[PDB]
Design a protein around this ligand. Structure first.
Ligand SMILES: [K+]
Ligand SMILES: [K+]
Ligand SMILES: [Mg+2]
Ligand SMILES: [Mg+2]
Ligand SMILES: [Mg+2]
Lengths: 187, 129, 150, 68, 82, 202
RNA sequence: GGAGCG
């Protein structure tokens, strides 16, 4: 039944790491009374490790879009329970989204704006900094040719994200390929 | 009304540069303005510029370094084939040794020297030197 | 500046950068849309529905809570008026000036403003016909305008 | 302040405070909500808790309001 | 400036304003070249200084004072002066 | 406790009302003003005034020949300080009215080619400041809140009106120039008395 | 010498 917590696209076989994440997810469903009720409906569809720095790993778990709103209500508590099981790792939930390529020249086919690459990358960035809310964005175009984005986070949720700023920057570059640094505006 | 956001951006920079300012704000922002700045940046005519997201159109703050003599648009955006680039440079640029005309081609926004290398024509956006 | 004067005022609303609802706003999207339909059936227009929500319910922006603008919500429930609200108010003003002008033939100031209001009606009606928010043959008629509004 | 004695990207929090709401580096409203039952600071409706005016609604001395 | 061989072909290289980066021409008699002396641990002039050139344009605008103040606030932190 | 060289000078400048500015502030002097009081008077930031004095002194010591420095004042209150400033620092003082053509007319007897020019008030010394801009002559000037900054390279934010303010400013500047030459011992004290710089009415 | 293209 631990494989009923994973629905990989195309009914593909979960890898050796997804089963560990799924198996760890099943345990919290029954062991933790607080999360008993909520975790029943929730399920994931992928999971991967990303190296951050200093032999540190980050568990990036993708979630069905329809369930992206249910995880938020139990995001703060669930991450605490999964991080202890996955010692020395940070858990990040990102809803799955499709990126439809722009139509060719003179094509009648339409494309919803949410399926655009820019709209998806911005949406991934918002799901990456949960529970922190973005309050500003800056993009600096360096003379050499590279560009770096600076994201301002609400200082209210600073205790739950101050230690993850390195994981956010590393996780976002692999999913988007863009440099990002997070900062808290003075208040 | 606002007709050419590129003209406002380049006119603001040119006025700021003559007054000896170090920074200048461009509003509104557009991907044409950003790509025009990148061409200037690659040739060392401006420093670092930063795009501010305001959920409407954005704003750009450009660092100036005192190397920019003039920058302006050409309106309307005339068509320029590869063979007619020479005539435009003889008209808009101080000499045959420096200064760039920015074109919008099907291969992207680029200066006239890159357009000759790729042998692609297009339309004139502006110039700077 | 202004379409029909030399005014250069800039006063307007300034939307905040935070598009999400505040943490203290507990009302859910289904509840908000239930109230929007409830007010529309009472005759209120989209402009004065949002004012009540902001002033009496703490809903600064309906789109932040429901994800859709008020007019779109009404259309989905078949409550959008046949004539758009803004065009409706211009016609009502033109009717008022004409009614005043019939008793005041020498009020040349009103005659001047009536021309501006009606030309504003025709520019807006043209736009709505292009976007198919009005019947293709819809036409503003001073003789029968007063029957439409009021 | 002279143009070169100021940074356009990091203006002082006091300078942006007194700038017009639309002329700040990022537009921000000057209004807000408060408890007393939320009330808009610039309410156009008669709540008699608040009396609408040309700007902020005139609140009543009796009740105490908490900004949120 | 330089011929195809490499020889210089300019009479001279005009100075550039330290604040605006403008060239200073031979008739710009409102331009001034300033020297700020360097001190030692005790605080005595050591014969070393930093040079600043200002064009007549910036001095006529009245912005020389603020331009000099900023240029010195940065330079002194680089050469150890304080 | 012992007061540093800066705290002592700032204490001395407070007693002389060097921080009291005019009711109007020039837009190029706002960077030196600290705050405006309900009286309408601006208060000059004495911390920045001391820093500009140090910068001015660094420029003065770099002059190999002190006779190339010319310090002058048009108002009577500063005619005494400039004479004493030139006495100890070796500069060339010109008290009173400036003769037009001094820096430009090479054939008149009073012709001079200074390497540096020190002034007490840009508003009252507008003639030498205007004329210095025809001979590549940098200028140092004590500038009040309502002083024009045109053609002023180093502006020292201070009260250049009161008789005590003018005397103290030149006393401190003269001490700094000598201390940077090694002629006198470091510290906020000087064997010379400041009252020698104050205006002596008839 | 200063001012003005004069
Ligand atoms: K208004
Ligand atoms: K003559
Ligand atoms: Mg306007
Ligand atoms: Mg018109
Ligand atoms: Mg003559």
């Amino acid at each position: 039944t631990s494989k009923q917590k994973i629905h990989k696209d195309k009914a593909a076989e979960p890898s050796e790491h997804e089963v560990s994440v799924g198996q760890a997810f099943f345990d919290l469903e029954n062991t933790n009374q607080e999360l008993k009720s909520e975790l029943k409906d929730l399920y994931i569809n992928s999971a991967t490790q990303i190296d951050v720095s200093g032999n540190r790993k980050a568990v990036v778990i993708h979630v069905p879009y329809r369930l992206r709103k249910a995880f938020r209500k139990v995001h703060v508590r669930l991450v605490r329970e999964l991080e202890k099981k996955f010692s020395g790792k940070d858990v990040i939930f990102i809803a799955t989204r499709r990126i439809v390529r722009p139509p060719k020249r003179g094509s009648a086919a339409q494309r919803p704006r949410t399926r655009t690459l820019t709209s998806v990358h911005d949406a991934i960035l918002e799901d990456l900094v949960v529970p922190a809310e973005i309050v500003g964005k800056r993009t600096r175009y360096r003379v050499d040719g590279s560009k770096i984005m600076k994201v301002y986070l609400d200082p209210k949720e600073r205790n739950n994200t101050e230690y993850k700023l390195e994981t956010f920057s590393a996780v976002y570059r692999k999913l988007s390929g863009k440099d990002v640094v997070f900062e808290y505006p003075i208040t | 009304v606002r007709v050419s956001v590129l003209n406002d951006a380049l006119k603001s920079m040119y006025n700021a540069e003559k007054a000896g300012k170090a920074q200048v704000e461009l509003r509104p922002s557009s991907k044409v303005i950003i790509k025009f700045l990148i061409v200037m940046q690659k040739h060392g005519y401006i420093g670092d510029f930063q795009y501010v997201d305001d959920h409407r159109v954005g704003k750009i703050v450009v660092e100036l370094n005192g190397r920019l003599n003039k920058c302006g648009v050409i309106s309307p955006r005339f068509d320029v084939g590869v063979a007619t680039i020479e005539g435009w440079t003889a008209r808009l640029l101080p000499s045959r040794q420096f200064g760039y005309i920015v074109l919008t081609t099907s291969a992207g926004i680029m200066d006239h020297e890159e357009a000759r290398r790729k042998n692609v024509g297009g339309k004139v956006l502006g110039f700077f030197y | 500046g202004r379409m029909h004067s030399r005014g250069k005022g800039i006063s307007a609303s300034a939307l905040p950068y935070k598009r999400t609802p505040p943490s203290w706003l507990k009302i859910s999207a289904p509840d908000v849309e239930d109230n929007i339909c409830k007010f529309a059936k009472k005759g209120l227009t989209p402009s004065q529905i949002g004012v009540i929500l902001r002033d009496s319910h703490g809903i600064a922006q309906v789109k932040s809570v429901t994800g859709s603008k008020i007019l779109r919500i009404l259309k989905a429930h078949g409550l959008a008026p046949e004539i758009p609200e803004d065009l409706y108010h211009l016609i009502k003003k033109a009717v008022a000036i004409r009614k005043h002008l019939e008793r005041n033939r020498k009020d040349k100031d009103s005659k001047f403003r009536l021309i501006l209001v009606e030309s504003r009606i025709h520019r807006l009606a043209r736009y709505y016909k292009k976007t198919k928010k009005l019947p293709p043959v819809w036409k503003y008629e001073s003789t029968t305008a007063s029957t439409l509004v009021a | 302040v002279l143009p070169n004695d100021v940074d356009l990207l990091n203006p002082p929090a006091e300078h942006e405070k007194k700038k017009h709401k639309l002329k700040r580096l990022v537009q921000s409203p000057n209004s807000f909500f408060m408890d007393v039952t939320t009330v808009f600071s610039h309410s156009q409706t008669v709540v008699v808790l608040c009396q609408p005016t040309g700007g902020r609604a005139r609140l009543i001395e009796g009740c105490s309001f908490r900004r949120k | 400036m330089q011929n195809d061989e490499g020889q210089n072909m300019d009479l001279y290289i005009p100075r550039k304003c330290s604040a605006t980066n403008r060239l200073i021409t031979s008739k710009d008699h409102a331009s001034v070249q300033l020297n700020v002396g360097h001190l030692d641990e005790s605080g005595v002039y050591t014969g070393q200084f930093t040079t600043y050139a200002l064009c007549g344009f910036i001095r006529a605008q009245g912005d020389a004072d603020s331009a000099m103040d900023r240029l010195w606030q940065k330079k002194k932190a680089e050469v150890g002066q304080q | 406790r012992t007061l540093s060289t800066k705290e002592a000078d700032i204490q001395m400048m407070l007693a002389a009302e060097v921080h009291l500015g005019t009711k109007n502030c020039d837009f190029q002097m706002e960077r030196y003003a600290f705050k405006r009081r309900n009286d309408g008077i601006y208060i000059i930031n004495l911390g920045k005034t001391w820093e500009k004095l140090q910068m001015a002194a660094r420029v003065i010591v770099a002059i190999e020949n002190p006779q190339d420095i010319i310090v002058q004042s048009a108002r009577p209150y500063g005619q005494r300080a400039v004479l004493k400033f030139a006495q100890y620092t070796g500069a060339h003082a010109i008290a009173g009215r400036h003769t037009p053509g001094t820096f430009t007319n090479q054939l008149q007897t009073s012709y001079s080619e200074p390497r540096l020019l020190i002034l007490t008030d840009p508003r009252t010394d507008h003639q030498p400041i205007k004329e210095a801009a025809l001979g590549n002559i940098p200028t140092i000037a004590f500038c009040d809140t309502d002083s024009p900054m045109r053609y002023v390279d180093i502006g020292i934010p201070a009260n250049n009106k009161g008789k005590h303010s003018i005397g103290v400013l030149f006393w401190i500047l003269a001490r700094m120039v000598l201390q940077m030459r090694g002629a006198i011992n470091q510290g906020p004290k000087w064997d010379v008395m400041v009252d020698l710089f104050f205006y002596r009415e008839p």
